[PDB]
mmCIF file of C-alpha atoms and ligand atoms in Angstrom:
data_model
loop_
_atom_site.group_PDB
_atom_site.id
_atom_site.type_symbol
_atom_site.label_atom_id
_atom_site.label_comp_id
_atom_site.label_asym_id
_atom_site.label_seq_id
_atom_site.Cartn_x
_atom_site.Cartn_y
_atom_site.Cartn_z
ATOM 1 C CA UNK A 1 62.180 112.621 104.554
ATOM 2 C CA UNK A 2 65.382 111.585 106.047
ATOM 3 C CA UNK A 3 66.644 114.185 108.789
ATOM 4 C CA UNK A 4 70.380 115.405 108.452
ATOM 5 C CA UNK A 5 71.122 116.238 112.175
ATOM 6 C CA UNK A 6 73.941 118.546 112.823
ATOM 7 C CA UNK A 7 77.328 117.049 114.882
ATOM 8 C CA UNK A 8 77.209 117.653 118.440
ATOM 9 C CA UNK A 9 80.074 119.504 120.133
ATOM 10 C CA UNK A 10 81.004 116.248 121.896
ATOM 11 C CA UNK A 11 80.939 114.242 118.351
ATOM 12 C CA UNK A 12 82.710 117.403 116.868
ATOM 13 C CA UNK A 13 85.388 116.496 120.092
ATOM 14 C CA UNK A 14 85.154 112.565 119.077
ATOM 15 C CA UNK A 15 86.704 113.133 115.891
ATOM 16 C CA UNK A 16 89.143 115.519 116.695
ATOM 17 C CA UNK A 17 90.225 113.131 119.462
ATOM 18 C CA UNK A 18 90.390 110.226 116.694
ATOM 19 C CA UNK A 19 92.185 112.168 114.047
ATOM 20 C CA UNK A 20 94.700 113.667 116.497
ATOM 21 C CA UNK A 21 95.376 109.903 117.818
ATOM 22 C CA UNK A 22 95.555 108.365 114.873
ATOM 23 C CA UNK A 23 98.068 110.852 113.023
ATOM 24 C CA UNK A 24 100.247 110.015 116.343
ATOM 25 C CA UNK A 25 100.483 106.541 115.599
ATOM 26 C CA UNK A 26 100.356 106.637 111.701
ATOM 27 C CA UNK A 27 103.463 107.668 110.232
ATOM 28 C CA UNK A 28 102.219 108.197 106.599
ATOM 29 C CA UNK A 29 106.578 108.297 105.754
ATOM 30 C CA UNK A 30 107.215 104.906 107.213
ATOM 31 C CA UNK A 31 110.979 105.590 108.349
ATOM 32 C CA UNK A 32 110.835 103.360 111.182
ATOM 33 C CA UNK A 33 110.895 100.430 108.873
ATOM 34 C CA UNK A 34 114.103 100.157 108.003
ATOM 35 C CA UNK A 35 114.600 99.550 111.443
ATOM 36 C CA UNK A 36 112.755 96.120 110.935
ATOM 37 C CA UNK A 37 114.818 93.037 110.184
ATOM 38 C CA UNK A 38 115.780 93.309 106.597
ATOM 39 C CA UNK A 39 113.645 92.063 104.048
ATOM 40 C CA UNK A 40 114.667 89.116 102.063
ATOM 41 C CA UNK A 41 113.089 87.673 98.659
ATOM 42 C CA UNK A 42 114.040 84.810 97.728
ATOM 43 C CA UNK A 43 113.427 82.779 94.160
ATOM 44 C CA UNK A 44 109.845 81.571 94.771
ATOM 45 C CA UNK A 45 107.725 82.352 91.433
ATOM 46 C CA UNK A 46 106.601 76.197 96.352
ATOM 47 C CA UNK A 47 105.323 76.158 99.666
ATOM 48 C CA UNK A 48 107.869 73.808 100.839
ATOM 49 C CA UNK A 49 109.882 76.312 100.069
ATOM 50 C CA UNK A 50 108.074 79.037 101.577
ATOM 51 C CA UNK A 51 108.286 77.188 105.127
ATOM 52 C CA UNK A 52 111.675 75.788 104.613
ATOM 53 C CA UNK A 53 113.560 79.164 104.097
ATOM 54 C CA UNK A 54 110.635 81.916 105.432
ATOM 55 C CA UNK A 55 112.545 84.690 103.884
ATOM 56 C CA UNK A 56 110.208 87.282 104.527
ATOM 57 C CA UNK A 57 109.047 86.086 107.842
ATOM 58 C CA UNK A 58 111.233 87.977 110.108
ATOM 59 C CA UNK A 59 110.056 91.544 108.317
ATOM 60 C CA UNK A 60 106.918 91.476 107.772
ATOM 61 C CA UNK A 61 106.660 89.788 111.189
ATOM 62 C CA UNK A 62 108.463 93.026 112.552
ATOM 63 C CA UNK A 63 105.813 95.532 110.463
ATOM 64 C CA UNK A 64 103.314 93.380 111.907
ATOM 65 C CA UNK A 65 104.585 93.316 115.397
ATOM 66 C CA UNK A 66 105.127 97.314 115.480
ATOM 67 C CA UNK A 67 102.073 97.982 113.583
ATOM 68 C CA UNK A 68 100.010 96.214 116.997
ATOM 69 C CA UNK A 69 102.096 98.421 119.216
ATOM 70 C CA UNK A 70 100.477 101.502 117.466
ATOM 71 C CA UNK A 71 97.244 99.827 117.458
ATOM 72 C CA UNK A 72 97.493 99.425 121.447
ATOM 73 C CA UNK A 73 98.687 103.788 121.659
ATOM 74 C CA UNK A 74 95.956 103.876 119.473
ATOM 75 C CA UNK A 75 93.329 102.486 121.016
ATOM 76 C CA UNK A 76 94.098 103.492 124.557
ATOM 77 C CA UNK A 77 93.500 106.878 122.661
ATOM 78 C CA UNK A 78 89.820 105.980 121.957
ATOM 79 C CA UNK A 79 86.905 107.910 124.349
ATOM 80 C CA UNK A 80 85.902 105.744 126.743
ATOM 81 C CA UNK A 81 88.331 102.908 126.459
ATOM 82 C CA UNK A 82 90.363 104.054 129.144
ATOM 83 C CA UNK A 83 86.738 103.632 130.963
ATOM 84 C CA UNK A 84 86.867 99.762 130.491
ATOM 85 C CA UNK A 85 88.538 97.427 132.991
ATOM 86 C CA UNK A 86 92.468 96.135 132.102
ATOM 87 C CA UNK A 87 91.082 93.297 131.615
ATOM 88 C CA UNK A 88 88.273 93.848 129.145
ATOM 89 C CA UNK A 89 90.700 96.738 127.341
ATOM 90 C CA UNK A 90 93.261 93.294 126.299
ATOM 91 C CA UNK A 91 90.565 91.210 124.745
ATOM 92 C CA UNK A 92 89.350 93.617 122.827
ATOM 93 C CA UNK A 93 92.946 94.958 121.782
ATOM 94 C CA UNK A 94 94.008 91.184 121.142
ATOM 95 C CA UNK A 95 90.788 90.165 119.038
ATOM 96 C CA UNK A 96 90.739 93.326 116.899
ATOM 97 C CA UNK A 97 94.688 93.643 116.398
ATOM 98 C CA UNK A 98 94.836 91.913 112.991
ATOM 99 C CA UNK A 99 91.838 93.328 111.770
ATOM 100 C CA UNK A 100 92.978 97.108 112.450
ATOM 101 C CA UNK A 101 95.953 96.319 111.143
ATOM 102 C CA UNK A 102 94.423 95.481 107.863
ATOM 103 C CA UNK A 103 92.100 98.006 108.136
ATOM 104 C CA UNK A 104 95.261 100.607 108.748
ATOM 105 C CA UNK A 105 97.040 99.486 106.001
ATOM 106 C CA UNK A 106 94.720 100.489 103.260
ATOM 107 C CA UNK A 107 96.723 103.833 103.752
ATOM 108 C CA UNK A 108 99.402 102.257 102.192
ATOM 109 C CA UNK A 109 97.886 99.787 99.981
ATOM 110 C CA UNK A 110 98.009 101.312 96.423
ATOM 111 C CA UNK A 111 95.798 99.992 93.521
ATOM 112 C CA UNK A 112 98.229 101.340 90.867
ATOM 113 C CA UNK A 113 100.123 97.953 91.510
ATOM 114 C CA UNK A 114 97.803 96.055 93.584
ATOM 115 C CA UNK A 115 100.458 96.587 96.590
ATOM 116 C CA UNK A 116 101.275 97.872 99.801
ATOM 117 C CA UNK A 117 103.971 100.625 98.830
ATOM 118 C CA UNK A 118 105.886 101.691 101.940
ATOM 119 C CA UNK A 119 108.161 103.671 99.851
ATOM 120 C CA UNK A 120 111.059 102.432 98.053
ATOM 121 C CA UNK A 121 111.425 98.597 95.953
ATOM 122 C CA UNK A 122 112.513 96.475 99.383
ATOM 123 C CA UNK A 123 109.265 98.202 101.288
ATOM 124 C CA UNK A 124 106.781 97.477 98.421
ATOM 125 C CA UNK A 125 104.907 94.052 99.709
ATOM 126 C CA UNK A 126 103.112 92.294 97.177
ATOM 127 C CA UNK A 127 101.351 88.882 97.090
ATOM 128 C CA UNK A 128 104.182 86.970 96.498
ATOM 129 C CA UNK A 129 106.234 88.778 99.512
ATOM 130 C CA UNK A 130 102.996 87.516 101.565
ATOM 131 C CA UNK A 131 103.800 84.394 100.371
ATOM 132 C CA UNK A 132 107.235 84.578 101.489
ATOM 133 C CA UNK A 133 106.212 84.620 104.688
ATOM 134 C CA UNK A 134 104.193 81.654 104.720
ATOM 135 C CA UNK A 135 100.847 82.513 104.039
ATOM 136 C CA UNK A 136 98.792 81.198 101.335
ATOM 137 C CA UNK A 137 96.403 82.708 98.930
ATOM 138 C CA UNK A 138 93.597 81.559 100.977
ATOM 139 C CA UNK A 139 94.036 84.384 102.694
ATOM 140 C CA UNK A 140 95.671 86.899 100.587
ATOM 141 C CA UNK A 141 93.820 86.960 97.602
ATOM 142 C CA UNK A 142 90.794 87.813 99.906
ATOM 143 C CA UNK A 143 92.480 90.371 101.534
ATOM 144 C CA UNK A 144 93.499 92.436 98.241
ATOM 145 C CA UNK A 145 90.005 92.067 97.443
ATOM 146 C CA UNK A 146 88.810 93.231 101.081
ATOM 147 C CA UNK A 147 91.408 96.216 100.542
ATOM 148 C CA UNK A 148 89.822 96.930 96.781
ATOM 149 C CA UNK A 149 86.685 97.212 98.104
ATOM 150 C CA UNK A 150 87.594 99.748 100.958
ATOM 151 C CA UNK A 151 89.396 102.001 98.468
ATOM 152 C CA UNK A 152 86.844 102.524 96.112
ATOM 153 C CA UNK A 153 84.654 103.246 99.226
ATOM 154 C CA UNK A 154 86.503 106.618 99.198
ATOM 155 C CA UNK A 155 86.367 107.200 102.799
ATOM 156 C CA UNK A 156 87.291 110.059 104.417
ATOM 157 C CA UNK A 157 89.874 110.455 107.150
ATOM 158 C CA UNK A 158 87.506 111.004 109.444
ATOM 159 C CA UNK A 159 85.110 107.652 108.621
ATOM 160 C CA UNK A 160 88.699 105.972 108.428
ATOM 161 C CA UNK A 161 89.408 106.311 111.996
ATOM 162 C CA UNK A 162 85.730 106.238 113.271
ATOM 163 C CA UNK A 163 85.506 102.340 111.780
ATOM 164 C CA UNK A 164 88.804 101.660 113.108
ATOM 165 C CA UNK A 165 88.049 102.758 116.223
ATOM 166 C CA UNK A 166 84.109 100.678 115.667
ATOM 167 C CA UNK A 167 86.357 97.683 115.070
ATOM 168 C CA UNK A 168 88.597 98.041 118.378
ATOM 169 C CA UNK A 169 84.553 98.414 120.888
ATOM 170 C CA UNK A 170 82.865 95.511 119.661
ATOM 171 C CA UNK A 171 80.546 93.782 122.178
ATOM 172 C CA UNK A 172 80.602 90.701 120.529
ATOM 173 C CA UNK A 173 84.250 88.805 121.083
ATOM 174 C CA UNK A 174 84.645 86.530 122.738
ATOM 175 C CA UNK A 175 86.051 86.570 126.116
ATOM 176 C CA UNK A 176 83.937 90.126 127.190
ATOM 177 C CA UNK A 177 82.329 90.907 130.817
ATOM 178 C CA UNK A 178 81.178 94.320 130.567
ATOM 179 C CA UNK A 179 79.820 94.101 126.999
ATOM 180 C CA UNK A 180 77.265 96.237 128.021
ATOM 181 C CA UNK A 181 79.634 99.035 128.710
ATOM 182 C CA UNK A 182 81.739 98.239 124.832
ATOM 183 C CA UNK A 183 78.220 98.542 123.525
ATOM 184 C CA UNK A 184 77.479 101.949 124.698
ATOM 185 C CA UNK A 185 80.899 103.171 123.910
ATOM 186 C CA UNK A 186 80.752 101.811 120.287
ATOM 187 C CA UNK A 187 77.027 102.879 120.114
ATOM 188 C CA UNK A 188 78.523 106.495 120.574
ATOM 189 C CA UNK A 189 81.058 106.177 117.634
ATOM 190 C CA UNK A 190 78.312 104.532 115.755
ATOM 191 C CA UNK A 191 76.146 107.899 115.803
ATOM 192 C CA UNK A 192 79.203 110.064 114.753
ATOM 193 C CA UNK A 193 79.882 107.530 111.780
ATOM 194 C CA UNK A 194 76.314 108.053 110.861
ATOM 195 C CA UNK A 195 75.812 111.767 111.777
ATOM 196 C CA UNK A 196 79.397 112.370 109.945
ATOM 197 C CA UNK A 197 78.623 110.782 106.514
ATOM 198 C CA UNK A 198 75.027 112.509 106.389
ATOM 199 C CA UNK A 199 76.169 115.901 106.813
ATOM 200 C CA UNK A 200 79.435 115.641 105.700
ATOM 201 C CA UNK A 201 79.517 113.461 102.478
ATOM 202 C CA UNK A 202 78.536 114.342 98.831
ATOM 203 C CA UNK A 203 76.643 111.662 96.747
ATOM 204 C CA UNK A 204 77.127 109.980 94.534
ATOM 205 C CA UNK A 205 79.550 107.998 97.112
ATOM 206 C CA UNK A 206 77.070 108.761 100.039
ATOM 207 C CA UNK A 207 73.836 107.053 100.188
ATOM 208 C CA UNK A 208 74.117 103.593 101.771
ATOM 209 C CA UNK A 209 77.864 104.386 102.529
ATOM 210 C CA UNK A 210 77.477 103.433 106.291
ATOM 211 C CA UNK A 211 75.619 99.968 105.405
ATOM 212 C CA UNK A 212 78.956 99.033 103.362
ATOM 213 C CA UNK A 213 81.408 100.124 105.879
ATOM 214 C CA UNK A 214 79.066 98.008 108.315
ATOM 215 C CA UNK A 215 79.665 94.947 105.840
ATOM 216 C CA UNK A 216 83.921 95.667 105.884
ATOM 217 C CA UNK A 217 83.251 94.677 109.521
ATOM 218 C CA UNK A 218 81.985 91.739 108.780
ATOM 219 C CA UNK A 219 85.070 90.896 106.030
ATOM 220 C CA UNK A 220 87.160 91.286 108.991
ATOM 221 C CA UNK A 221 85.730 88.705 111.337
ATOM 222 C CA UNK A 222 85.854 86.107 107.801
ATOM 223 C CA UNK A 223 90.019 87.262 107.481
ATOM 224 C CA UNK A 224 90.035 87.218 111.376
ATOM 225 C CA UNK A 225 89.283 83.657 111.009
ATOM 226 C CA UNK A 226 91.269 82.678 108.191
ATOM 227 C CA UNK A 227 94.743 84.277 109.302
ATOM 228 C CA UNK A 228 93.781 82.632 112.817
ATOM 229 C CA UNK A 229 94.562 79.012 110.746
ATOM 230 C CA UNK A 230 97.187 80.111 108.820
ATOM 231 C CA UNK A 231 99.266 81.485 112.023
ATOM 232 C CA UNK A 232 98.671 78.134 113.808
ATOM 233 C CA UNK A 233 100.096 76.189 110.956
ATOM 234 C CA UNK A 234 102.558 78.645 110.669
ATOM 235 C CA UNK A 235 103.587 78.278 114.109
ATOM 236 C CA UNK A 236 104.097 74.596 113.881
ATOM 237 C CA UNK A 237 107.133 74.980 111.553
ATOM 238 C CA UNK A 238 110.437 74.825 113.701
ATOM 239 C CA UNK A 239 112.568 77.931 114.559
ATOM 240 C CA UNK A 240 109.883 80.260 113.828
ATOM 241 C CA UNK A 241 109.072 81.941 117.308
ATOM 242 C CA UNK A 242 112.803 83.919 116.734
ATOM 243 C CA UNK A 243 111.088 84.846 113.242
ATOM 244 C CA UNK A 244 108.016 86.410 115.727
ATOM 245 C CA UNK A 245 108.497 88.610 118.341
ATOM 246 C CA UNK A 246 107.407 88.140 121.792
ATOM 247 C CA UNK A 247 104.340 90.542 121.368
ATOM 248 C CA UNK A 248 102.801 88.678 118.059
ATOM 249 C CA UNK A 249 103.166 85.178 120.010
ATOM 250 C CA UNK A 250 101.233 86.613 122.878
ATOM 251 C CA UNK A 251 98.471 88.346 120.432
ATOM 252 C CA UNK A 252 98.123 85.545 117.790
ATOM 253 C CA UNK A 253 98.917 82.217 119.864
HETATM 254 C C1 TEJ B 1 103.717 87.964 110.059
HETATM 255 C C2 TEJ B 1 102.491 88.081 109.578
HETATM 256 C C3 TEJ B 1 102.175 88.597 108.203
HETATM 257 C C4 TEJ B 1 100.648 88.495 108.148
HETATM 258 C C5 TEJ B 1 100.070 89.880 107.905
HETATM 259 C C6 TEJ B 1 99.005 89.974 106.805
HETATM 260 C C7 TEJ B 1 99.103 88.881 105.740
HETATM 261 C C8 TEJ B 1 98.895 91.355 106.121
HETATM 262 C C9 TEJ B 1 97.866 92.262 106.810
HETATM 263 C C10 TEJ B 1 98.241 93.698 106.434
HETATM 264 C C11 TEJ B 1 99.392 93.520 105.446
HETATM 265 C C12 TEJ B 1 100.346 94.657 105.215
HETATM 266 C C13 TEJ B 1 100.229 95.805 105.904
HETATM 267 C C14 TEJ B 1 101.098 96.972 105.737
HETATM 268 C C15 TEJ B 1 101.349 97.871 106.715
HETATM 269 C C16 TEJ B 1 102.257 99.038 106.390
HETATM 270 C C17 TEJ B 1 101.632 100.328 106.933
HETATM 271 O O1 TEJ B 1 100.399 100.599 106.258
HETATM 272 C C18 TEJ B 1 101.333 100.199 108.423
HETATM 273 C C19 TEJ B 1 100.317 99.095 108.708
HETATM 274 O O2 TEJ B 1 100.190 98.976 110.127
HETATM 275 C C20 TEJ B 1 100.795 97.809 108.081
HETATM 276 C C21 TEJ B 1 100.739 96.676 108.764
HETATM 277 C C22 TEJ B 1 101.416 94.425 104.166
HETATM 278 C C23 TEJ B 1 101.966 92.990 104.216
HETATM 279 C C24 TEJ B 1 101.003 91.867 104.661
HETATM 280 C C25 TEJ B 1 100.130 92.253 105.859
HETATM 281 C C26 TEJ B 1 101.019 92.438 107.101
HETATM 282 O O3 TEJ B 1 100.198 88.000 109.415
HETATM 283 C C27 TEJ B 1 101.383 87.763 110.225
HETATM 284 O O4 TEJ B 1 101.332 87.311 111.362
#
């Protein structure tokens, strides 16, 4: 019964656009990092501990920080978000940072170790690294298991960047005025998600693909939350704004 509707030339276009933007702001190598304040592990195994020292603060805080510069090229890169006001393009860059990042990562994240491997032993981040950086498993062990799920979903590049760029237009954050505009923009990418994975993907990984990509969405908003309260009590440790940057105070406080 169910129709399998060619892409248009203008979705054809979309996803060109989206590959060719994302590849720009990817780099699959990662040899900027060692440009980051150097990593440090301490001997952990407390999280008095954790917040005392923050070894791993100032790094990852670095990969974070460039990673929402990339996200902002990124995103400016998206059809029709140069078409939304200044003012509308920041909350939805601001509210959807974290998240993309996250979602970005899984390019990295390797389930041979249950890591992100960024190259080399002092760019593999495991749990414990997270935890180095004050953040608790609240959070973490959730994430892995948000980051399982998405690679067994096998997606392709192209439904990669489509739901990254789906997480970047939502209508619903707060702090929107033209959420009618977002809406139409995301309802566009939306209909090349769906027309891609219908015409373009083999079962058995296929049918009901888009539903569960719809549901990573929603994981996001649930780790959205939680790193939301684990930033704020982060924050209230002393000398730890010169462990951010100026850029992931703005974003996250
Ligand atoms: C300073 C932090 C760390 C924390 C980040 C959280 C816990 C996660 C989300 C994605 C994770 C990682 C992502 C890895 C990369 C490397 C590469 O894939 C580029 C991508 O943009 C990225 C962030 C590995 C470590 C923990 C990160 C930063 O939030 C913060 O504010």
């Amino acid at each position: 019964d169910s129709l399998r509707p060619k892409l248009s030339e203008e979705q054809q276009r979309i996803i060109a656009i989206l590959l060719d933007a994302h590849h720009k702001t990817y780099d699959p190598t990662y040899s900027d990092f060692c440009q980051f304040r150097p990593p440090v592990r301490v001997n952990d195994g407390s999280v008095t501990l954790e917040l005392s020292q923050l070894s791993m603060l100032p790094h990852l805080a670095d990969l974070v920080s460039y990673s929402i510069q990339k996200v902002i090229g990124f995103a400016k890169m998206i059809p029709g978000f140069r078409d939304l006001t200044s003012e509308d393009q920041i909350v939805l860059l601001k509210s959807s940072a974290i998240e993309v990042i996250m979602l970005r990562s899984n390019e990295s994240f390797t389930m041979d170790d249950m890591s992100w491997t960024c190259g080399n032993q002092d760019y593999k981040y495991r749990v414990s690294d997270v935890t180095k950086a004050g953040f608790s498993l609240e959070l973490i062990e959730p994430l892995i298991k948000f980051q399982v799920g998405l690679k067994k979903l096998n997606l392709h590049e192209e439904e990669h960047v489509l739901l990254m760029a789906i997480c970047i237009v939502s209508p619903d954050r707060p702090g929107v005025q033209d959420a009618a505009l977002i809406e139409a923009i995301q309802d566009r990418l939306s209909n090349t998600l769906q027309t891609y994975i219908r015409c373009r993907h083999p079962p058995p990984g296929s049918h009901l693909l888009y539903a569960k990509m719809i549901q990573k969405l929603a994981d996001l908003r649930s780790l959205n939350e939680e790193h939301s309260k684990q930033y704020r009590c982060l924050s209230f440790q002393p000398e730890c704004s010169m462990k951010l940057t100026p850029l992931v105070l703005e974003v996250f406080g």
